[PDB]
Each structure stands twice: as C-alpha cells, then as structure tokens.
C-alpha cells in the first residue's frame, strides 16, 4: 500500500485534440503541433492550444477590436492574429491597411479589410509568413460578456442576473427584491 498524496490516474484537465470533427481544423492542428514542438517559439504553443478551444472559449473579434489593437504604439504594422471568427463592426468609419489572420471572417469583416487594402489570410498562410510568430499580435474576444455567464454565481447579494423567462413588473421584483416587500436579496 501507498499513502497517496494526490488523486491517482488524474487526467490533465486541459483540452488536446479539439472536440471538433472539422478536418481543416485538424489539418491546422497537425501543422501547429509540429511548429510548437520544433520551433521553441512561444507563439506556436499558444496557437496550438487555442485551436483546441470550444466555441464559447473563442469569442468573436470585431474589426473594431482589431483597429484598437493596431492603435497600440509600435503595433500598427503587426499581423493581427485571431483564432476564431472576425466579425464586422458598423460602429467604425475607418479601417487601416492591416493584415489579419483568422480562422474565419464574416462577409462584412473580410470586405472591410480588403477594401482598406489589407489581407484576410488563414492561419496556414500566417504560418508560412511567420513560422515563429514574428511581428504578430494575438487578439482574443470578450469572453465574460456572453449571456450565460451573467447568471453564474447567482445568489444573495451577488448581483448576477436571475434565470428568468418573462421580464417586467410582477416577474420577480417583489418579496426578496425590495424592503417594501419583506427584505432585499
């Protein structure tokens, strides 16, 4: 017998081998496992694990988010890299000439980028141009702003968006939610 200090036969807890059955995603994985093993570039390691991520863990990146990213000083000519969808933002009126590498582009997002004179490349094209991830800037979308997460941690005095169908007066705005009816949370 052994006095075990930790749980035995414990799986890693991180993803490898993305859950997706998409062959082209798997093709990108096999390319980036090779890069993450033979290159020593930290960029290739994070791209490899980012390709395993589930859809909610790959929030969309709007071209607004990229334009702000390219406004970092020294970052104007960097290759913007996003593992996921690049979406189009109609709240901006100017887009620079940048290069964006992404898994997916929406029709407006791709049209916005090419009209400004830049490129809309995939991650296999980025690897040819940047095997070590040279001059790249990885863009991640907002992950804690989706609708599901605002119900996480719901409890007394937490302010976390009850799970509710109908919204309005007489839908959970009473006893327990105001001091004029009992108590407040």
């Amino acid at each position: 017998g052994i006095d075990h200090t930790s749980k035995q036969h414990k799986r890693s807890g991180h993803r490898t081998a993305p859950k997706s059955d998409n062959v082209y995603l798997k093709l990108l994985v096999k390319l980036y496992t090779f890069l993450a093993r033979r290159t020593d570039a930290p960029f290739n390691k994070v791209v490899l694990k980012a390709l395993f991520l589930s859809k909610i863990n790959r929030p969309p990146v709007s071209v607004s988010r990229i334009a702000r990213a390219l406004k970092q000083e020294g970052a104007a000519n960097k290759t913007v890299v996003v593992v996921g969808t690049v979406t189009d933002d109609a709240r901006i009126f100017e887009f620079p000439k940048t290069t964006v590498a992404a898994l997916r582009f929406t029709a407006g997002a791709r049209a916005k980028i090419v009209k400004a004179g830049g490129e809309c490349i995939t991650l296999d094209q980025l690897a040819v141009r940047a095997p070590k991830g040279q001059n790249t800037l990885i863009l991640r979308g907002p992950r804690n702003s989706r609708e599901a997460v605002r119900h996480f941690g719901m409890g007394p005095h937490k302010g976390k968006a009850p799970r509710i169908l109908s919204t309005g007066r007489k839908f959970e705005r009473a006893r327990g939610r105001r001091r004029s009816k009992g108590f407040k949370v």
């Binding site: 017998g1 052994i2 006095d3 075990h4 200090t5």
Partner: protein, 222 residues
C-alpha cells in the same frame, strides 16, 4: 560531414577529463573520511590521557525508515510521514538533524525506525537503491551523467559526490537529498530481531531511535 573520428574523439576526451577529476575528488573524500574518523579516535585518547572525557558531536544525519503500514494512522503523524517522503512501509529517506526535523521525528516515532547511518550504509544505499527524481520520474542513477545533469549546478558530479553531500551534511544537502527518490527497502533479511516491532527499540521493540543499530537493520533491509 564525414563524422567517424573527430566528434567521438572530443566527446571521449571530455569524458576522460571528467573521469580524472571524479577520481581526484573520490581520493580526497576517502582522505577526508579517514581523517575524520581517526581524529575522533585521537581526541578520545587525548581526553582520556588528560583525565577528561571526550564527548562526540551529536550526529548530523539520520536515516529514517517507515516500519508501519498505511492503515490507521492519525492525521498529524500521517502528514509528517508525507513531508518526510515515507508513504510506504520500509521506505527510507535521509533527514538532516535539526530541531525542526528532530521534532518531526518524535511525532512519527511509533511508525518508524531510525538512527545514525555510517558512510558504509549510505554508500550501499545509494549504490544499490539509488534513484533520482528527474522530471517527476524515478530514474535509476546508474551513471555519473545522470547526477551531473541534475545536480551539476551545485557541483555534485558523481555518485560519490552525491554520497559525500549526504554523509557529511553539506550546503546543498536539501537539493541532493530531495533529488534522491525515497529509498525502497526490503524487509530485513534475517528478520527484525524482536518478536514485536511496534514497541520502542528501548522496550525490546523496533520503532524509535536506535542510534547506531540502524546500520545493521538497514544493511539487512538493503
């Protein structure tokens, strides 16, 4: 890239140089070992000559071996056995003797036998059952390169360099001792010498501090 003699010659020459200094260092350790034991003997003779009593230094190293199984152990000694890396019966580790570690030993006294190992048993422990913790893996020492690749930053280059850092508790004892995987000993070849293990050694049992008699117990377990 013809590569028949040029590359292998340099590597063998580098290996030969590492052997010469390992040989030089092992000769120095033997001289230091022999000097210390004689000097203790000479001091005892001199104190006897001048009508006085020579009190030997308190032993600086203990080897502790867990002699109890893993069932029915109260939480505090169970935590101490884990921090001493004794998670199996007959598992043994070296412990640098200090008040911080001595109080640890008194807590786990009913579950272990320990004492003061000599150079002979440490050499035999490391040679026979010596495994290094490398990448969280238990790899047999079996080669000077394996210690030099993991403890060379502390100047420990050979198996004897590792043994030296254990027998004479050195500045890098903690790194050298933790590098060693907990020793996995057998049951004693001739038995425990007592009918019942789970009394103190003083009471005719087996657990607790047997000062020098750990050498006989360990050598028969190793």
């Amino acid at each position: 890239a013809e590569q028949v003699a040029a590359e292998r010659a340099a590597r063998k020459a580098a290996n030969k140089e590492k052997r010469a200094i390992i040989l030089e260092r092992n000769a120095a350790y033997q001289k230091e070992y022999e000097t210390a034991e004689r000097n203790i003997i000479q001091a005892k003779r001199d104190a006897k000559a001048a009508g006085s009593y020579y009190v030997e230094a308190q032993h600086k190293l203990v080897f502790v071996v867990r002699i109890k199984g893993i069932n029915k152990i109260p939480p505090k000694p169970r935590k101490v056995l884990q921090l001493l890396r004794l998670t199996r019966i007959n598992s043994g580790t070296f412990v640098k003797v200090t008040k911080a570690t001595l109080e640890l030993l008194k807590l786990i006294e009913p579950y272990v036998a320990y004492g003061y190992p000599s150079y002979s048993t440490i050499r035999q422990l490391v040679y026979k059952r010596g495994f290094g913790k490398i990448n969280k893996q238990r790899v047999p020492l079996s080669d000077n390169a394996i210690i030099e690749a993991n403890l060379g930053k502390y100047g420990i280059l050979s198996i004897d360099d590792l043994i030296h850092e254990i027998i004479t508790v050195g500045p890098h004892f903690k790194q050298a001792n933790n590098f060693l995987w907990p020793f996995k000993l057998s049951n004693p070849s001739g038995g425990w010498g007592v009918p019942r293990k789970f009394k103190h050694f003083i009471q005719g049992g087996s657990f607790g501090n047997r000062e020098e008699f750990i050498n006989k117990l360990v050598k028969s377990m190793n």
